[PDB]
Amino acid sequence: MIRSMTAYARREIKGEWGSATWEMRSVNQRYLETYFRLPEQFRSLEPVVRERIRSRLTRGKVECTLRYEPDVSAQGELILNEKLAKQLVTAANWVKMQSDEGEINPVDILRWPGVMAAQEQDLDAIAAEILAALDGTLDDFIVARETEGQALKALIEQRLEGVTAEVVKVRSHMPEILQWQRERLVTKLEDANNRLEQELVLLAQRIDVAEELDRLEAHVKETYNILKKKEAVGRRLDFMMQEFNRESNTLASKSINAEVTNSAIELKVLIEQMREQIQNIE
Amino acid sequence: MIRSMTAYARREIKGEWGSATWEMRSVNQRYLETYFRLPEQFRSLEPVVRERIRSRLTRGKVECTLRYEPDVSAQGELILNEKLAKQLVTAANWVKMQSDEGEINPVDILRWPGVMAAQEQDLDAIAAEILAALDGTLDDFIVARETEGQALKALIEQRLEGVTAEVVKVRSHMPEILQWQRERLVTKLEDAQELVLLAQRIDVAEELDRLEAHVKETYNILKKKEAVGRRLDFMMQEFNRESNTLASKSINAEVTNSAIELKVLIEQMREQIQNIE
Amino acid sequence: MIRSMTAYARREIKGEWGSATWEMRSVNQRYLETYFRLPEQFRSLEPVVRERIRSRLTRGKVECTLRYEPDVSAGELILNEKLAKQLVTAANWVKMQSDEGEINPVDILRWPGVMAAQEQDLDAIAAEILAALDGTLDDFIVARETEGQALKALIEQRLEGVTAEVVKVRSHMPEILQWQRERLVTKLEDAQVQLENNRLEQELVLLAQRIDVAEELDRLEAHVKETYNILKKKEAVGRRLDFMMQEFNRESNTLASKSINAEVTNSAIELKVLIEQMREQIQNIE
Amino acid sequence: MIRSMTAYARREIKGEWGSATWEMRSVNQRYLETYFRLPEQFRSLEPVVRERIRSRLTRGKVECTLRYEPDVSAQGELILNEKLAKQLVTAANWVKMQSDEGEINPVDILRWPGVMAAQEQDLDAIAAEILAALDGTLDDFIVARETEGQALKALIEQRLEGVTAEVVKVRSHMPEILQWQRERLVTKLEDAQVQLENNRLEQELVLLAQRIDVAEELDRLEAHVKETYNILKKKEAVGRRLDFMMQEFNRESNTLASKSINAEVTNSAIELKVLIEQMREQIQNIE
Amino acid sequence: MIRSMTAYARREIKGEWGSATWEMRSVNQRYLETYFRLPEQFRSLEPVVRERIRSRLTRGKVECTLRYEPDVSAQGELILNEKLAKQLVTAANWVKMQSDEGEINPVDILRWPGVMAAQEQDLDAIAAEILAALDGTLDDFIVARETEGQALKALIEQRLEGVTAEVVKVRSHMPEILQWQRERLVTKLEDAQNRLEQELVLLAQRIDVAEELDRLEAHVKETYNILKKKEAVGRRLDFMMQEFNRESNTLASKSINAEVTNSAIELKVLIEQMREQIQNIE
Amino acid sequence: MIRSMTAYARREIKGEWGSATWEMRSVNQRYLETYFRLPEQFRSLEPVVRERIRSRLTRGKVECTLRYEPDVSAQELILNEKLAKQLVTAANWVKMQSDEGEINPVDILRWPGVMAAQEQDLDAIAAEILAALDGTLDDFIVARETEGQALKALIEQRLEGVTAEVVKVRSHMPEILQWQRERLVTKLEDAQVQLENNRLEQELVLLAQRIDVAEELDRLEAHVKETYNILKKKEAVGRRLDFMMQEFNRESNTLASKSINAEVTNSAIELKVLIEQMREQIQNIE
């Protein structure tokens, strides 16, 4: 069950206290990178949310944003500190006697800190519900990372069927070609004995690609095994494609017929198509 | 039918609610890279945008930008908390009694946090219209790719004709090639123990026949509906292989000059293929 | 010793003056960058906090914040009468230049320092705050040292897996060489061609040299032994480990290129996976 | 071509929107590090700038700063939301009826968010101009590296000439020293003792000549300067290959100073070790 | 009065202006390397503080850090920038001419940045107080060096006592040693009269064990004399241990007696143990 | 005129445009490393300051910081008149909707962008900054030469001790060479080894010429005379002196190895001590 690095998932929780929205987005990356945007009230929640994200995700760049819109009507009714307000008025009266002018503004006294305050302090209860909501949107994020990736797995397996069908097309042509190479050489040597076949068969071992086709088939069987294991295989699959293309290039190099060369090109096209999908794999 | 990797297309939809613009540009790239610049309100549309673009475009580095301009009257309405405003006015009246002076500033009451708030309009009907404009931008984008791709197809076909013209030109010197072919073989016999005269490959007719089939295959590749950019690049490497083998053989001035011209045509074709998806 | 460049540590100190909790976190960054979020009362403490943090922390992007809430302590406040008179006389000079204006009393009280809390002394709170800061920093260093030791165990776990893949390849190597020469003679027996004297031996020597990977395997084992030595000596560990990974990777690529067996190729891929896993942890090293 | 890892490049473009300045500074470093300091508006351009620089530059430590100056007066005329302003005034009128007093400040209405908003100028045309100025700065930067590399090569070749001058300075002085050492031995021996079998004298003179002989290290120093000039001629892996020669240069100079029986030869060996250190200063700057 | 290179000392001075703290720590080094961490206000003190550390210390790697913590006080008078205030009033007059109305608030002009500037603190009186605290820290740093240095001196003298004790153990075998020395000479006289070469004169120079023990006992009495010196003797004692090993190399190389060989090995173990402690002596 | 690598120099200048301070400090380094902390207005001066410093400094790690404090326009502030008119016209529109209000002038000035960037003649100021850099750079070298003269006196004081130890060994050497003739022949008589008569006497003095340290003392005295000559060079001689001390230490080790007398061994140790003391002063020499 392979997963992809790029996915999106947003969840919004509505309550009397307020509305909070968790958004998670991700893009392909070489290593895991985490970025968190949180409100000031839930800034203390940043270490807790980072451990959950990092434990669940092995690789990829993920940005998580939480936006809290509290309800001011559900906010507790404001209390007026009468002693502090009188303490500020008598202080301003002293300033007015020094300046011999000025007028106290009532709104400014209310704006002074501690004069009008709210003591709801319900943040701890809603934070536990936000943490439970974070696990829900993180599961929606993981299920989206696992939804796609099954499609990527099918695309790679479809190309893996194309490379194995392409080597059997080379396997049938090759013995016919090996005999043809001896014939054209003999006609050229018209102007030129025993043990000439001894040098021919050693040259034919350099032309033969059976050992290389065997390795390529072994790499395909391994690639099927790599897709089934449940771990990070994004980079391992990329290293495997370098060996796929290594055998394709040495096959196109030792190719002496145009039919085999066209098959080697088809192999390299399928490898490029697989490498494009492996980039999206974690 | 082949599509160039670089193209540009913009579409703007105007309505009473506001105006939005879909700008989309692309450049050449080995694999498909999708970068989206979307407003915070339409940030949720990003997975839907990626689904539509990735399905339609096989390869290339594409950047898509969306900019939304809301009408100043639309998506705009003030919500005034009447109870909280009355609470602040009565609290300020109490302060005015202790101070025996002062005047309540109205805008200061509005700037109090809980007093003023803005309502959230339903962007669902707009988002569906913004999403439909993206489909139209993709249609204008792929046709601009096909228009530039047809010019690249003509340049490659024009130089494929010069490749075949050079292959026929060396086959006029074919009788001289056979003379030089046998003469090289007998001179090595004259020089004569690890005598691998068999290992020497001097045949050039197979190289020309093998190269001539690649040209016929290249025309067939250009007719394909799927992406052909990477396949043509691999094909040029085989064009270069047969030119490199023909390059090693020094026969006469006309043959060597034709081999030089062949490699120039391949490089000119390979430069245009980098622009092909 | 080695220290993990990313770590977290917070501490809360409660007192009669109020409650203040120091919280500092770090992420892996190529340079030292300290961002502080301090209250207005402790805004003057910004320079001394920066010097103390940067003296013990050599590298990394650190975000340190302090949350402070004043305690009413059940309402009387002190008034800086001299500072208020200083501002009124300074405003009177401005009024004579402008020839207009009125001094707002609340605006004078809004000036910093004009109003102060009687229940608390700012200098006494700052001394407790500064003493709490170095306590968080000392625990912050330990949080880096413990997680740094965790990164060391990860690299050693992958190093022993690297040296296990090398001896796994060298066990297959003699069998592979004999399989290649036996594959050659079987085709000569099928072809019934007359065998020549020492022509076979010279071809066997040539292929043996092409498949020979002895220098790459010995060079890989020298790299793992050097990596343990670099990991033991705790001087410039973060930089010197980066160079070893490039040497590990080019020997693995050279091995994968010169390989003729699919099983050896699979082992070379495993090496490159282990190298990539080691590189991921080396970035976290300070 | 050899290129110095220390250079400075600057490029300024003038436009109606303002002026943009690029600055490049490079310091020697074993790895390739690139640090970028861009404005908040063009912070999205960093991954595009990083690709062009990392692809065109070899190893080193590079710092990039982009300074963007807005004209302010020439562009960005403020637009007034008349509908929102009237909405706030009617809302404030309601509060005025409740309080039965107050006065609406006009500038307070303008300072309300969204009332007076400047139209955002599309930075697409300006960012393309900045990207075009970047590759022009990289061109000046590469040229500066190549011109400084030629200066480092001249300094290395200048010291190499001083190395050969010291080697032949020792070679001419060596036979004079070997004759004086023979003349001293026979004089000390004849002063207090008799000649010993004649052939024993020749044996001791041969042993003495072998101990003071430095011709092997002296010939090996001259072989090192010829390979060093060839290495400078080669433009492939010049930095890694040139470090090895300095250790070999310093190896032969140390063994030469150890076998130096004459003070003028020892001073020449020290001058060699000074020239080697001066060459080592330039090689850490090259690739 | 020998001193160890590793030592630590701190001092804090308190005043109404604030509090400052010096902190010195050192480790072993071949030469003297000093590193200073100073506040930006007292950066100018770096050349002065270096000369003082340099005067009382000869070798070692010290790191000297200074923490300056001024008390947070708004008591400092704020200068009224009369120039800038007049610049703002004339600018506001222009706005009044355009609007044809308005009034300049004096408090708002004061709130404008730069109009009220805090008086620069003359730290000359504080710097002299901080420099005086450095002298106290250096004095505490030196006594910490001398305290640890006395323990090293006692440990070296204990090892020197074992050296002389092992010498006496070999001195008893001296009549047996002189027999073995004479046996080496007569053994080299083999096939005596075909090569005209006499290694006997050379061998008499190489096996002068009696002079080694005498010269070794002279090095011990000199080592005691070196410990009583006032100047730093760290490098001198290390050079002395090289000579201790030279006199004991012949005893370990030649097996005159199994008991003598054991005593020679213990003799070289003591030299290595003294070498380890001399690393810590300045 | 030798110069120490560690030095400090700080200069402060005042003008109508403002006040700026150059600060230069340096420490020991193998080669020359220059780092610059410059304001944003004078970041363009960095390539000019670098060539100026590198011209007069041969090696060392030097940090060069410049603090520039701008002064408000003394003897008028530039004001965006069109933006201010646009805000007054917009406020007038609000005043007719509300039918009340008064435009506060300071509130218009507080608006972002109304106060344009203040006029500064950066070209005329930078020329004064460059002239102050030269003064600080010349003031920096005076601090180098002052400390260097102290290092020169310490080295010359130890060089006098070297020649004093050399002549002490020189005087005792002819006596000790005679003592070995009588010492070696006595050991031969103890074992009753037959004398070779004249041939023994010849080999004895040939061996004595091998033990004779007079050749090492002559070379060492020539190195002392050369070290005085090196101290008079105007160029940097920090590295050359270090290479010279290696030859000092080479002859001393050869002296201690060939030593046969405890007093000569103690004198060789005194030589090695003086050489280490000179090396400690030399490590600070440019």
Side-chain angles (χ1 to χ4, degrees), chain B residues 173-184:
Chain B
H173 295 255
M174 185 70 166
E176 185 179 355
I177 293 178
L178 271 301
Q179 272 289 115
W180 170 83
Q181 187 159 355
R182 296 178 292 264
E183 185 177 1
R184 278 281 305 272

Side-chain angles (χ1 to χ4, degrees), chain E residues 75-93:
Chain E
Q75 313 294 136
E77 278 70 29
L78 263 58
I79 320 174
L80 172 60
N81 197 339
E82 297 175 335
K83 293 88 178 179
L84 177 59
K86 292 179 291 186
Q87 301 289 281
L88 298 174
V89 170
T90 56
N93 290 339

Side-chain angles (χ1 to χ4, degrees), chain C:
Chain C
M1 52 175 295
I2 70 174
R3 296 173 182 87
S4 177
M5 194 151 50
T6 172
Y8 177 85
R10 75 146 197 82
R11 219 63 54 184
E12 53 176 1
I13 302 299
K14 304 175 182 179
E16 184 177 0
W17 39 272
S19 56
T21 301
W22 277 104
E23 178 180 1
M24 54 185 304
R25 67 186 76 90
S26 65
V27 298
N28 45 359
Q29 190 77 45
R30 293 186 295 186
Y31 40 78
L32 176 60
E33 175 184 348
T34 57
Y35 271 26
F36 302 102
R37 341 284 180 181
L38 313 180
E40 298 87 13
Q41 304 296 324
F42 301 130
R43 203 67 55 93
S44 177
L45 281 71
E46 162 75 23
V48 65
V49 169
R50 187 179 187 92
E51 286 283 349
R52 188 172 308 181
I53 294 298
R54 301 189 74 172
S55 65
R56 290 182 63 94
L57 294 180
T58 58
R59 206 198 304 177
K61 198 272 165 297
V62 185
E63 305 172 358
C64 185
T65 181
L66 174 65
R67 338 283 188 89
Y68 175 68
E69 320 296 336
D71 188 20
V72 176
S73 189
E76 190 75 13
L77 306 165
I78 60 176
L79 300 73
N80 196 339
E81 291 114 345
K82 178 170 289 188
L83 178 58
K85 289 181 292 186
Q86 287 178 357
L87 298 174
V88 171
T89 57
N92 286 323
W93 180 91
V94 178
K95 275 170 54 185
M96 292 178 61
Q97 301 294 325
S98 62
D99 294 320
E100 60 178 7
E102 191 179 28
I103 299 175
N104 198 321
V106 176
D107 291 358
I108 297 294
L109 303 176
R110 284 157 47 95
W111 196 278
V114 176
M115 293 297 300
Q118 178 172 341
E119 305 286 340
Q120 61 182 19
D121 293 351
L122 190 58
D123 290 348
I125 306 172
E128 176 65 40
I129 285 301
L130 289 177
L133 175 68
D134 59 70
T136 69
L137 189 52
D138 290 1
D139 298 357
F140 193 86
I141 299 294
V142 176
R144 293 194 160 189
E145 292 175 348
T146 56
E147 179 60 22
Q149 287 297 119
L151 304 174
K152 181 178 182 181
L154 295 176
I155 299 181
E156 291 181 347
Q157 170 191 350
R158 274 61 168 88
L159 275 167
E160 67 183 1
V162 164
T163 192
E165 292 292 332
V166 180
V167 71
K168 185 181 299 182
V169 171
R170 199 147 61 191
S171 66
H172 283 89
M173 220 59 204
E175 181 179 7
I176 293 170
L177 177 59
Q178 312 304 327
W179 193 93
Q180 173 55 228
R181 77 168 185 177
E182 288 184 5
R183 201 273 296 261
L184 179 61
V185 299
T186 49
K187 187 60 177 180
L188 303 177
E189 297 168 11
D190 294 6
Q192 268 269 347
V193 292
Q194 174 68 31
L195 312 181
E196 309 186 24
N197 292 5
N198 298 348
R199 287 281 290 103
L200 279 66
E201 309 295 331
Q202 290 179 339
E203 299 295 331
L204 297 178
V205 167
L206 179 62
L207 291 179
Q209 296 165 341
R210 297 171 175 265
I211 311 175
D212 192 17
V213 298
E215 280 284 352
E216 278 65 37
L217 296 176
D218 292 3
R219 200 163 298 173
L220 282 169
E221 292 183 336
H223 286 322
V224 303
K225 185 180 183 180
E226 178 67 19
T227 308
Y228 284 115
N229 181 27
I230 301 164
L231 216 55
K232 280 285 188 176
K233 301 182 63 60
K234 313 301 208 308
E235 53 165 3
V237 290
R239 306 196 310 272
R240 188 163 269 269
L241 289 174
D242 286 311
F243 169 80
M244 293 303 302
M245 300 303 106
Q246 293 190 12
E247 293 297 329
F248 274 114
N249 202 66
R250 68 155 50 188
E251 302 298 325
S252 301
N253 285 324
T254 311
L255 201 162
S257 173
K258 226 162 188 172
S259 66
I260 204 69
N261 193 332
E263 211 67 37
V264 177
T265 301
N266 295 335
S267 180
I269 299 176
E270 179 65 41
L271 290 173
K272 303 170 69 171
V273 171
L274 297 169
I275 296 164
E276 183 76 354
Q277 293 170 336
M278 287 186 295
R279 282 180 170 177
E280 184 174 5
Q281 313 298 335
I282 290 172
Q283 288 188 343
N284 295 14
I285 294 181
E286 186 180 3

Side-chain angles (χ1 to χ4, degrees), chain D residues 25 78 82 96 103-104 107 180-181 184 193-194 197 211 260-261 266 271 273 277 280-281, chain F residues 30-31 34 46 86 93 100-101 107 111 199 202 210 215 219 223 239-240 243 246-247:
Chain D
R25 182 188 179 183
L78 300 180
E82 295 172 337
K96 288 189 302 181
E103 189 174 12
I104 298 176
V107 71
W180 172 90
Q181 202 69 59
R184 166 161 181 168
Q193 295 300 141
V194 188
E197 302 168 344
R211 301 189 67 91
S260 296
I261 314 296
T266 312
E271 181 65 30
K273 295 197 284 185
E277 183 78 347
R280 280 173 169 171
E281 182 169 4
Chain F
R30 195 186 190 192
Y31 308 112
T34 68
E46 183 175 0
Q86 185 185 191
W93 179 90
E100 59 183 350
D107 293 359
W111 195 277
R199 189 166 199 271
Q202 300 300 144
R210 304 286 297 185
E215 291 279 6
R219 279 177 280 181
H223 296 152
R239 311 290 295 107
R240 166 175 281 99
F243 303 143
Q246 301 175 14
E247 310 304 319

Side-chain angles (χ1 to χ4, degrees), chain B:
Chain B
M1 48 212 306
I2 65 170
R3 302 173 179 177
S4 67
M5 315 200 73
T6 174
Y8 168 79
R10 62 164 300 271
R11 179 182 294 268
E12 177 186 6
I13 47 181
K14 300 178 182 179
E16 186 176 356
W17 35 270
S19 59
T21 311
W22 279 103
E23 192 176 356
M24 183 181 301
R25 46 172 173 258
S26 67
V27 296
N28 303 5
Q29 201 82 4
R30 191 181 189 184
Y31 305 109
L32 182 73
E33 298 180 353
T34 56
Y35 303 95
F36 307 119
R37 321 300 172 185
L38 303 178
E40 299 88 5
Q41 302 176 349
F42 302 102
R43 198 192 314 177
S44 175
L45 278 70
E46 182 185 4
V48 195
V49 172
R50 176 176 286 103
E51 174 192 7
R52 302 180 180 273
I53 287 193
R54 279 194 174 270
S55 300
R56 198 49 188 165
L57 303 178
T58 308
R59 218 164 53 91
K61 178 188 184 303
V62 188
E63 188 203 33
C64 191
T65 77
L66 170 65
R67 45 203 66 175
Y68 177 63
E69 308 173 7
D71 174 51
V72 293
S73 186
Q75 296 83 46
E77 185 62 35
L78 299 186
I79 301 299
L80 173 62
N81 195 337
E82 291 118 343
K83 280 78 179 181
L84 181 53
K86 288 181 293 185
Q87 287 180 358
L88 298 176
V89 171
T90 56
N93 285 285
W94 180 92
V95 178
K96 287 185 300 183
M97 297 190 308
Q98 318 298 316
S99 63
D100 282 323
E101 65 174 14
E103 189 175 18
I104 300 175
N105 198 327
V107 67
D108 291 358
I109 299 293
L110 274 64
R111 295 205 62 85
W112 199 273
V115 172
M116 295 295 291
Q119 186 67 233
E120 290 283 335
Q121 296 295 333
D122 194 63
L123 304 173
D124 296 354
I126 297 178
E129 201 157 28
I130 306 305
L131 200 60
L134 174 63
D135 280 316
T137 311
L138 266 172
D139 297 336
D140 300 354
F141 177 78
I142 59 179
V143 299
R145 287 192 147 193
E146 294 178 340
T147 303
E148 175 67 14
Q150 285 298 125
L152 304 173
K153 183 179 181 179
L155 291 170
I156 294 178
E157 288 183 345
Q158 174 187 354
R159 299 183 163 93
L160 286 174
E161 299 174 12
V163 169
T164 46
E166 221 73 17
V167 174
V168 181
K169 183 142 58 180
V170 308
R171 286 208 174 99
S172 62
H173 295 255
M174 185 70 166
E176 185 179 355
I177 293 178
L178 271 301
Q179 272 289 115
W180 170 83
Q181 187 159 355
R182 296 178 292 264
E183 185 177 1
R184 278 281 305 272
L185 193 79
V186 305
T187 48
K188 187 58 182 177
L189 295 160
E190 166 200 1
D191 298 351
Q193 282 73 25
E194 197 72 17
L195 185 54
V196 282
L197 178 56
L198 177 88
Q200 172 187 356
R201 218 70 53 82
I202 197 180
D203 192 2
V204 84
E206 298 299 324
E207 307 173 356
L208 300 169
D209 295 2
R210 206 184 306 105
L211 173 65
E212 190 177 6
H214 294 151
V215 179
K216 189 178 186 178
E217 178 68 18
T218 308
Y219 284 111
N220 183 24
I221 297 175
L222 294 168
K223 305 291 173 295
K224 297 169 60 64
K225 202 81 65 175
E226 60 180 357
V228 303
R230 308 294 292 111
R231 180 180 277 98
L232 287 174
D233 190 9
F234 302 143
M235 176 61 65
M236 298 298 103
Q237 305 176 11
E238 308 304 320
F239 275 70
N240 220 38
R241 272 187 176 89
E242 324 302 332
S243 297
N244 283 325
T245 57
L246 170 66
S248 59
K249 300 159 179 54
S250 174
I251 311 178
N252 61 72
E254 281 285 352
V255 172
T256 58
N257 287 345
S258 298
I260 299 176
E261 177 65 28
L262 283 172
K263 303 204 65 179
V264 173
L265 294 165
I266 298 167
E267 177 73 11
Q268 292 173 339
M269 282 185 289
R270 199 166 186 173
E271 182 260 319
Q272 311 297 338
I273 290 173
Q274 255 95 51
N275 299 279
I276 296 184
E277 183 179 29

